[PDB]
């Protein structure tokens, strides 16, 4: 019955069942050194933030489990980003996740949704929010049949590079090209290359994860779900005509996730991009594959363009 | 004459006598006209002035020194070594100092073909000795043989060129290089004229479009700070653009050079050709020549790099 605690779900600490409805809220200390580490995605300034995949790992843990119970495909959807968490690893911080539904009598058992609520506690700060959806696989279907699509696109990519059309980044310059705007923890420094078609911020990445250290129990690994967003981060802000000094574009949230096929540690994936050109947001799917099979996908990534400085200047705060 | 410009100010000695001469001249980099362009490099948030500040100045005084002990001249700016980094603080005067010294025997002073120079800060009535060189009134034999070598450096640039058109070597355009540099340095944007470089990681070896169009250059100088600094930057993102130097840790920064020759004007609304292979203690060095379509335009022999750690370079810096 219980829900299993993970490197990133520590402890339960109200759960309560109700006629119309049931509140499961957990916590995690985010400065325990087994996660801790891992809590530190980016370097902004010389401050630590903690990515929004780690709420989406904890996210898919408390609605896989919510799911179960009341009785398999769990969407984190609807994921806002409000307010930088930034890891002090000065004693306990404690990131209380809670997680609510709603039913009609007797009905627990047809709930597809429940609302998540990620904040920090000594109230501290509300971060984030997200809703878990209990979805079909009528869109694991449709990516199935656009595989051959997705594969063209990638292969149209490296054709254009070996054409001398389009940038490929190895993994080491790429983060160098980032690292005035950002730095990684080592464990998140997993796009192997990437191929960069700018004029429609276009782009095919090799994401290996054996390039970085993974230990621990998740659900679907911070690091490893952040390193598919990072496909889309760096096909905007490495554009020629961005100038990251001055605006730079940065994680807000997306519409819907999903995972088909464990993210292997041991494995390397193809991720695949297509964001365009979009007032003060930009948004666009991305799809994860592992040859020819369907392993992720980001439907409405969104990133935010915001002034580099302004950046600096809140997180300082 | 010694014509007073840009990056020259004022004499402040001059002495000629029986064995030899002196000639110390200044230069305000706090004077508006040229304390921006005093300002080529930013580590750290720190103004810091390029070597090429410092050939400019002795192009000029060497020129001067060359021209008058003649009746009737190549002046090649050697043995440049930096000791000192010269931070433009933009507080009030900041007085550069440039010393030449020459000496030749009692006969003719005629004959000299070499002098040394130092280049020192000082306060409003000595604060640092930066750098120094020996600028030397040199024959035409390399400019000869550089030109019978076009057709070589050519073909190297043309397939550094063909290489990228096959997906083998990295090009990267003027905004993308300069980002992949940023967390080491930014420059003042009258210094960010390299259009594009092609880069062959394996031998540190690169083929560059620099377009001075790209920048302004106003003033007056002998070799604009600027364009000469554009010319080594090529070497220098040659070294720190390659993928397995992490310029969080290690970077490779100016030390000097052997020597440098101009031999056409640089043109502030004309782009120009550069090729180096750097190749592979703790410097590094290597040619680097420029080009104007089939014309040799200037050349570095001996253009020297050397690897320092990037948080002791902060440290001394921020000191
Ligand atoms: C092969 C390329 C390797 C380099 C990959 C770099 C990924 C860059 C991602 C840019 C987004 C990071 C910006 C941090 C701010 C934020 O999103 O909250
Ligand atoms: C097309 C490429 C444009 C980018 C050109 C960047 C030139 C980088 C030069 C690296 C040397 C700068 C390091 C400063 C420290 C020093 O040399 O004293």
Same mark, same amino acid.
């Given at each position: 019955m219980e829900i299993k605690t993970t490197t990133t779900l520590h402890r339960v600490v109200e759960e309560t069942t109700k006629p119309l409805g049931a509140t499961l809220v957990v916590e995690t200390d985010i400065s325990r050194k087994d996660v801790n580490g891992l809590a530190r995605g980016h370097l902004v300034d010389g401050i630590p933030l903690c990515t929004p995949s780690f709420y989406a790992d904890i996210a898919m843990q408390v609605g896989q489990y919510s799911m179960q119970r009341l009785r398999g495909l769990v969407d984190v959807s609807d994921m806002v980003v409000d307010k930088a968490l930034v890891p002090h690893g000065k004693?306990?911080?404690l990131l209380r996740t809670t997680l609510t539904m709603e039913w009609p009598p007797k009905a627990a058992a047809t709930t597809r949704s429940a609302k998540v609520?990620?904040?920090?506690?000594?109230?501290?700060?509300?971060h984030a929010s997200c809703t878990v959806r209990f979805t079909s696989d009528a869109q694991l279907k449709s990516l199935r049949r656009s595989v051959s699509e997705y594969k063209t696109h990638i292969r149209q990519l490296h054709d254009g590079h070996a054409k001398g059309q389009f940038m490929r980044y190895n993994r080491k310059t790429g983060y160098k090209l +980032? =690292? =005035?705007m950002a730095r990684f923890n080592p464990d998140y420094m997993l796009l192997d290359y990437l191929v960069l078609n700018e004029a429609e911020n276009e782009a095919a990445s090799g994401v290996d994860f054996s390039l970085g250290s993974s230990?621990?129990?998740?659900?679907?690994?911070?690091?490893?779900?952040?390193?598919?967003?990072?496909?889309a981060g760096f096909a905007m802000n490495a554009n020629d005509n961005v100038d990251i000094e001055?605006?730079?574009?940065?994680?807000?949230?997306?519409?819907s996730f999903q995972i088909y096929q464990p993210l292997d540690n041991s494995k390397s994936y193809?991720?695949?991009?297509? +964001?365009?050109?979009?007032?003060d947001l930009v948004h666009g799917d991305v799809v994860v594959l592992d040859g020819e099979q369907i392993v992720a996908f980001f439907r409405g990534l969104t990133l935010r363009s915001v002034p580099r400085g302004a950046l600096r200047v809140v997180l300082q705060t």
């Open positions: 004693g306990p911080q609520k990620f904040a920090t506690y000594f109230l501290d700060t509300e +980032m =690292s =005035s230990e621990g129990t998740f659900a679907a690994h911070p690091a490893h779900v952040d390193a598919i967003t990072q496909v001055k605006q730079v574009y940065v994680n807000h949230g997306w519409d193809q991720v695949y991009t297509k +964001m365009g050109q979009a007032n």
